């Protein structure tokens, strides 16, 4: 009625809230470990299906407190419908989504990402967003990408959902172990890095390496998350100098900035299928010993009937 006008008009200074950061990833990737550790608690409890984390972001510059909603999603496809509980129309425009590719198993990176490339995409249209709002947010995100200062092209954002997106590859410490235990070549690191950069480019995604065991760039990841979901001041440069852990700001990417990384490796020119140049991790567990079935009385007895007939 009349009150709902008058009292609402008396508004004071606040900070935007209700933001909804979403994490889909392949199961067994330590997604929960990363999100919990960044939250501050070393690790909550895991489980099945959708999980909730209220990420408390405090701004000392304004001295305020806010909570974003980490809706971390289970990896199994049979738990894909419950994603309707994660993203809806009133929540969609202010959602940021990060996929997690556990580098402990590089052989399962791209398709897992590409699984996301289906799932969220499907979920973004099953909800039937009206075309005008999807279009306006898409062009808004395109502009927000283009104005990076520390672009346009055929594949840049060539298919995207118009909300900010990251590809946070966890467990980067493991790259050392799988380097020596597998003789996994450094040029292969360059190849996965370039392919991930092409993936993030066609989604305009900012890519970040991070290692929980090394507590590496966790502060940087927090900074970037707060910068994107809120719009906080950002000062970190494009940390791409060392290959152990890299931070690719959304917009720093260019086709030539991937060409330079293409140049240094000369093993197999990168158009090749990701999976081919990486080596499959062979399955360890042996197949169960075959059934020692007993021949039934009937065909057995018929066989002895035949034997006695031979007599």
């Amino acid at each position: 009625s009349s009150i709902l006008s008058e009292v609402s008009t008396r508004a004071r200074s606040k900070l935007p809230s209700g933001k909804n950061i979403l994490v889909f990833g392949e199961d067994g990737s330590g997604k929960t470990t990363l999100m919990t550790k960044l939250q501050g608690a070393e690790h909550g409890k895991k489980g099945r299906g959708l999980e909730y984390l209220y990420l408390s972001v405090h701004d000392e510059d304004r001295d305020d407190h806010t909570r974003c909603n980490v809706w971390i999603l289970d990896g199994d496809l049979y738990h894909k419908g419950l994603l309707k509980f994660a993203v809806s129309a009133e929540s969609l425009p202010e959602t940021l989504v990060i996929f997690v590719a556990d580098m402990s198993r590089p052989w399962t990176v791209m398709e897992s990402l590409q699984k996301w490339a289906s799932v969220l995409r499907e979920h973004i249209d099953k909800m039937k967003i009206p075309p005008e709002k999807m279009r306006e947010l898409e062009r808004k995100f395109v502009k927000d990408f283009q104005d990076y200062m520390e672009p346009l092209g055929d594949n840049v954002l060539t298919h995207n959902l118009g909300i900010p997106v990251l590809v946070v590859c966890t467990k980067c410490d493991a790259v050392s172990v799988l380097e020596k235990e597998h003789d996994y070549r450094d040029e292969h690191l360059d190849f996965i890095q370039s392919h991930l950069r092409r993936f993030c480019l066609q989604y305009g995604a900012a890519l970040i390496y991070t290692s929980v065991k090394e507590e590496k760039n966790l502060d940087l990841l927090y900074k970037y998350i707060v910068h994107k979901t809120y719009g906080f001041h950002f000062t970190t440069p494009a940390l791409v100098v060392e290959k152990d852990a890299v931070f690719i700001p959304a917009g720093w990417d260019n086709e030539k900035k991937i060409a330079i990384l293409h140049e240094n490796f000369t093993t197999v020119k990168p158009e090749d299928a990701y999976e081919d140049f990486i080596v499959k991790p062979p399955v360890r567990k042996l197949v169960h010993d075959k059934e020692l079935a007993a021949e039934d009385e009937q065909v057995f007895l018929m066989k002895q009937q035949s034997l006695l007939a031979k007599q």
């Binding site: 009150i3 009292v7 008396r10 489980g47 909730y52 209220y54 909570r67 199994d76």
Partner: protein, 194 residues
């Protein structure tokens, strides 16, 4: 107006409770022949040693999860709505009555409308109830029950005073002009040549 646990707690704790009611039946160890079948010389994987597939063995499909979370998206959503209502009383501390007076200058008489819905806005408030329950979530308005009470009481008092003040002014208009017109009628010159 604060939430001592933020509204996200109302959802996180319920999710933990649901997780407990799932683990009570899910984390059961799996019957396995490896007790003597040592031929699989490998540390039993968590997703088989602990029998973590029951969610996919739904007789009714995943609808169960769909309903469960839905209940939560019921329970939390509307209760946040209730929380929202309480936050609306924030205005009792940061508002200018001059703005209201200017906005509703010369209403039905002066306001006569919001002074009616304010009495209804005494709802969610000024009742023997001290804590609103809903399911397993109880939101207790104990610290504010008297504070917002005193503020809203005084504010309603002042609005009533201003309203009734100009109402009395208009009734002075009422009686004065009625009496003067009555005297004019009481001149009673019914027959006159002019």
């Amino acid at each position: 107006i604060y939430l001592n646990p933020p509204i996200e707690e109302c959802r996180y704790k319920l999710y933990q409770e649901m997780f407990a009611w799932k683990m009570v039946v899910l984390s059961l160890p799996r019957i396995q022949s490896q007790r003597y079948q040592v031929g699989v010389h490998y540390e039993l994987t968590e997703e088989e040693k602990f029998y973590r597939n029951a969610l996919t063995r739904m007789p009714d499909g995943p609808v169960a999860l769909e309903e469960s979370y839905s209940a939560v998206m019921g329970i939390v959503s509307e209760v946040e709505q209730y929380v929202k209502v309480w936050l609306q009383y924030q205005c009792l501390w940061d508002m200018q009555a001059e703005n209201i007076y200017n906005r509703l200058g010369e209403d039905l008489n002066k306001w006569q409308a919001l002074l009616v819905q304010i009495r209804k806005a005494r709802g969610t408030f000024d009742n023997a109830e001290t804590k609103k329950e809903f399911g397993p979530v109880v939101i207790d308005y104990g610290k504010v029950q008297s504070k917002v009470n005193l503020k809203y009481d005084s504010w309603h008092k002042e609005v009533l005073s201003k309203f009734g003040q100009m109402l009395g002014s208009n009734m002075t208009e009422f009686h004065s002009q009625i009496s003067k017109s009555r005297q004019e009628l009481e001149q009673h010159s019914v027959d006159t040549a002019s």
